[PDB]
C-alpha cells in the first residue's frame, strides 16, 4: 500500500513532514567539510574528464 504524489498544495502543507534542524549531511560531500572548507586531495581541473 503506497500513496501517489499529491496534486493540491494544502495536502503538502498539512502533512506531518519534519523540517531540517541539525546540520545536513551528504554521503560523499562529508569528506569535504563545508563549502568554505571544501577539501581537494589532488589539484585537478574541474573540467577534467576521466578516460
Amino acid at each position: 500500500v503506497d500513496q501517489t504524489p499529491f496534486e493540491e498544495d494544502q495536502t503538502w502543507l498539512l502533512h506531518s513532514i519534519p523540517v531540517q534542524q541539525l546540520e545536513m549531511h551528504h554521503h560523499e560531500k562529508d569528506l569535504q567539510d563545508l563549502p568554505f572548507i571544501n577539501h581537494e586531495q589532488f589539484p585537478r581541473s574541474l573540467e577534467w574528464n576521466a578516460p
Binding site: 503506497d2 500513496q3 501517489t4 504524489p5
Partner: protein, 51 residues
C-alpha cells in the same frame, strides 16, 4: 491517491512480455542495488536548484 501496487505475471497476459519490476529485480541482482521497502511513492522531489 492511496492504492496498492499491482503486478501482472506474463502467464496472465494474452501477449506475454517481460514486466518492469522483474527487470528492476534483474537490475538489482547484477549491480547489487538496495531496495528500500518503506520508500514512499509520494516523496519524489527533484533537486530543482541543480536539475
Amino acid at each position: 491517491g492511496v492504492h496498492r501496487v499491482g503486478y501482472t505475471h506474463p502467464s496472465t497476459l494474452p501477449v506475454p512480455c517481460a514486466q518492469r519490476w522483474d527487470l528492476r529485480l534483474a537490475r538489482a541482482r547484477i549491480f547489487q542495488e538496495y531496495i528500500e521497502e518503506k520508500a514512499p511513492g509520494a516523496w519524489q522531489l527533484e533537486d530543482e536548484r541543480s536539475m
